[PDB]
Structure 1
Amino acid sequence: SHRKYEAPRHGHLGFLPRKRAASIRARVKAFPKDDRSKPVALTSFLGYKAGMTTIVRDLDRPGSKFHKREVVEAVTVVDTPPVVVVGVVGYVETPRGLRSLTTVWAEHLSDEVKRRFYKNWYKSKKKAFTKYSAKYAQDGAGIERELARIKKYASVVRVLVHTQIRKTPLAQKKAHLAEIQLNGGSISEKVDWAREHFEKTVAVDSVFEQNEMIDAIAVTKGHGFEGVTHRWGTKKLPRKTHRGLRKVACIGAWHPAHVMWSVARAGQRGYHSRTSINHKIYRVGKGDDEANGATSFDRTKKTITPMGGFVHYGEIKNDFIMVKGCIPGNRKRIVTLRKSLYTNTSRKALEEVSLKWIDTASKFGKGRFQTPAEKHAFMGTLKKDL
């Protein structure tokens, strides 16, 4: 017999299975569409989610009521030290898909990245890539031909890069490593560009620019084994109910005499791969610079790191990003940035953004002061201030 009063599917089934990811570093499924008219350049980036904060700016959409008025917006901050390019691989295409035929690395490597190759590093000979360097230590002994092979073949190229987890304030010492597709120019140009960029930093001033809409790709925060009621948004059953109300009551009919997949069920919430899009960048900023927190309107020399620091992160002394809104992922976590796939204009992706003020107050409480100068000014001296 039919459902007496209608209502929709609780939850979304495209996002199934709701299971723990394969990694703490979300796979980038898809990059943009390669084009040759442009120059060779990256199409992605890596950083570490630091936290959120709040800003002020003057909206401009001709027809709103806050047109040419102030707003206040929640932004999310990423610490993006420049990634060390080492290596590239070449993907030839088959009816069975793209396929790597070669992975060319660089001669010299950092302890962080070969640590990522290792697990127990403190008891190790640190024997890695030595015979690769000895394939190096000559002009081109067994490298030039791999490169020219990649030139003769390999419709697609992906550059291997790694992060600077020691430049971060974290406590890992184990670099993150990944690939990025290049979507510019020709293949020979891509590979020689990468050869030039072996062992070399690359930075966000080169990959991105303000008022660009992007995708944030990351793994969403783990919440353990969880009931159906938070995991799906199901109605709490009523008070008088023997044996539990944080449940689904019927989980299927007599026939088919099975539990349908679409029914809700308890289990893992979080640590899930997610790919959110259309996150306008509001500011690139520099580690090797002060006044990161200061707009043209404020001009009070102050960086972005609030008083007492980011909660669970620390400081932003590297190059960093401020993007509108939330993103998948929690603090201290990796994040994979990405150019869009589609030239969304919409009078929302083109809205040019200039900022006014940036909350650099303490998130470890309810902070009244953006600066200890301001603090001492408002308060006067103190007993400790001899």
Structure 2
Amino acid sequence: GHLGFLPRKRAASIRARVKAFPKDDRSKPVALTSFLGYKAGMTTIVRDLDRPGSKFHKREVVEAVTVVDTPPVVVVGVVGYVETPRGLRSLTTVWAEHLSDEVKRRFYKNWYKSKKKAFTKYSAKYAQDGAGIERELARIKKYASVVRVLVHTQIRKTPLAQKKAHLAEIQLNGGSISEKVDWAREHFEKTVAVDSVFEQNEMIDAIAVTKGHGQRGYHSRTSINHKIYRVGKGDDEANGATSFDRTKKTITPMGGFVHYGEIKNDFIMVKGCIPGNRKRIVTLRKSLYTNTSRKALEEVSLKWIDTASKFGKGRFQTPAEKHAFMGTLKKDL
């Protein structure tokens, strides 16, 4: 086997962590660098390949893509790390007062017995014009090279019963640290959209903990360069409808995904297969650099999204496709 993947041992968490972060462009205004979500099955996809110089130029091409449930995500804190001779050293993190039940729940292993007294005497540290709070912001604003944001999943929106929000650090590649903080100041408690991190037709890498078996498996793996096909939004009906097909249907197959629910909010559709399995948390980073290849230049024209039920077999797409073929039966009339 491969030597570099040693020790082949258990990951620390269900949530694998972003080892690297994208560099910096100081000319840009402030931008997030990554985003989190949950793996949700595999779907078949067809489109015409507008790749020049190709043996499959302009022809129809069929490929399996994974959909990842990515809800809008909420800031609860900002962090400042100083550069040291010894690397990096978070000198201060600072939070946002109005924390949700989901975030607080991350601070208790036993939520039921608890007196739920968590960010409380810290919330009374907030209760004034600022003073102590605005001090610790100025602390960061003075020193510290990289400014990272504390955020958590909106898991109540999720069709998962795990109920306990995941915390993940995501840094900021917007230039000047004065801007960095004065972007995190305004964006405390505010929910952050998925389409405001990634567009369609983009290369991204993904992180996830791998499908455990019986030691074998259950390692953190990062795959690199994967094209986002579709960014959909939960408020817009007909996600399955392309510019071609245009029949009103959701990307969710008839009766939800395999061991995963209805997709009642925003999602990402990524080329090929993300590591791990459905339910697992994945964090998507924006590829560290600019990989200008014709593999990355092409803007895709999706044709049709296979929304057949993968549980068992799928001969049809919508419930409207069952009774147009069957007609009408016993229990109906």
CA contact (8 A) 2:83 2:144 kept: yes
**Where do residues 167-186 of structure 1 align in structure 2 (5 Å cutoff)?**
167-186=157-176
Is the contact between residue 46 and residue 60 of structure 2 (CA under 8 Å) also seen in structure 1? yes
Percent sequence identity over aligned pairs:
100
Q: Deviations over 1:90-139 (max 9, x none)?
A: 00011101110001011110001110111111111101010111001111
Question: Does structure 1 conserve the Cα–Cα contact (< 8 Å) formed by 2:255 and 2:262?
Answer: no
- Deviation of 1:178 after TM superposition, in Å, equals 1.0
State the structure with more CA Rg.
Answer: 1
* Structure 1 residues 216-258: Cα deviation after superposition (integer angstroms, max 9, x where no partner): 10100101xxxxxxxxxxxxxxxxxxxxxxxxxxxxxxxxxxx
Cα displacement (A) at 1:148: 0.6
User: 1:112 aligns to what SS in structure 2?
Assistant: helix
Could you give the per-residue CA deviations for residues 319-373 of structure 1, whole angstroms, max 9, x where no partner exists? Answer: 0000100011101110010101121111101111010100001010111001110
Answer whether contact 2:308 2:315 (CA < 8 A) is retained: yes
Partner of 1:68: 58
RMSD (Å) for aligned C-alpha atoms: 0.9
**SS of residue paired to 1:192:** helix
Deviation of 1:311 after TM superposition, in Å, equals 1.0
SS of alignment partner, residue 131 of structure 2: coil
Q: Once the two structures are superposed, what CA deviation does each residue of 1:155-207 show, in whole Å capped at 9, x if it has no partner?
A: 11100000011110000110011110100121010001001000011111110
1:159 aligns with 2:106: no
Query: 2:31 touches 2:173 (CA, 8 Å); kept in 1?
Result: yes
Q: Deviations over 1:288-319 (max 9, x none)?
A: 12101110101101111110110111111110
- How far does the alpha carbon of each residue in 1:259-285 deviate from its partner, in whole angstroms, 9 at most, with x for none? xxxxxxxx8211110000111000000
Cα distance in structure 2, aligned partners of 1:218 and 1:309: 22
Shift of 1:141: 2.6
Kept in 1: contact 2:23–2:289 (CA 8 A): no
Q: Could you tell me whether the CA contact under 8 Å between 2:25 and 2:175 is conserved in 1?
A: yes
1:141 is aligned to 2:131: yes
Distance 2:257 2:111 in 1: 30
Shifted more, 162-171 versus 55-64: the winner is: 55-64
- What secondary structure sits across from 1:204 in the alignment? coil
User: Comparing 321-330 with 55-64, which one deviates more in the overlay?
Assistant: 55-64
Residue of structure 2 equivalent to 1:323: 270
SS state of the match for residue 206, structure 1? coil
Give the secondary structure class of the aligned counterpart of 1:326. Answer: coil
**Which whole-Å CA distance do the structure 1 matches of 2:177 and 2:48 have between them?**
43
Which of 142, 147, 150 in structure 1 is aligned with 2:140? 150
Q: Provide the rounded CA distance (Å) in 2 between the counterparts of 1:61 and 1:369.
A: 31
Q: d(CA) in 2 for partners of 1:39 and 1:340?
A: 19
Q: Tell me the distance in 2 between the aligned counterparts of 1:22 and 1:64.
A: 44
- TM norm structure 2: 0.98
Q: Which runs of 5+ in 2 are unaligned?
A: none
2:204 aligned partner:
214
CA distance in 1, matches of 2:175, 2:226: 27
Aligned-pair CA distance for 1:65:
2.2
Number of aligned residue pairs: give it. 333
Aligned to 1:190: 180
TM-score (norm 1): 0.85
Per-residue deviation, 1:27: 1.1
Unmatched segments (≥5 aa) in structure 1: 1-10, 224-266
Q: Offset of 1:48 from its aligned partner?
A: 0.4
SS at match of 1:268: coil
Find the residue that maps to 1:131 and give its secondary structure. coil
The whole-number CA distance in structure 2 between the counterparts of 1:175 and 1:194 is 20
How many Å separate the matches in 2 of 1:136 and 1:104?
11
1:66 deviation in Å? 1.4
Residue pair 2:207, 2:275 contacting (<8 A) in 1 also: yes
**Distance in 2 of aligned mates of 1:156 and 1:346:** 29
The aligned counterpart of 2:195 is 205
CA–CA separation in structure 2 for the residues paired with 1:268 and 1:106? 42
2:234 counterpart residue number:
287
Q: Give 3-state SS (helix, strand or coil) of 1:199's partner.
A: coil
Higher alpha-carbon deviation: 125-134 or 341-350: 341-350
> 3-state DSSP class of the match of 2:62?
strand
Once residues 61 and 367 of structure 1 are traced to their aligned partners in structure 2, the CA distance between those partners, rounded to angstroms, is: 31
How far has the Cα of 1:33 moved from its partner?
Answer: 0.3
Q: Distance in 1 between matches of 2:53 and 2:78?
A: 49
- CA distance in 2 between partners of 1:273 and 1:382 (Å): 50
Task: Please give the per-residue CA displacement for 1:60-88, whole angstroms capped at 9, x wherever unaligned.
Answer: 22222210010011101011110011101
Name 1:263's counterpart in structure 2: none
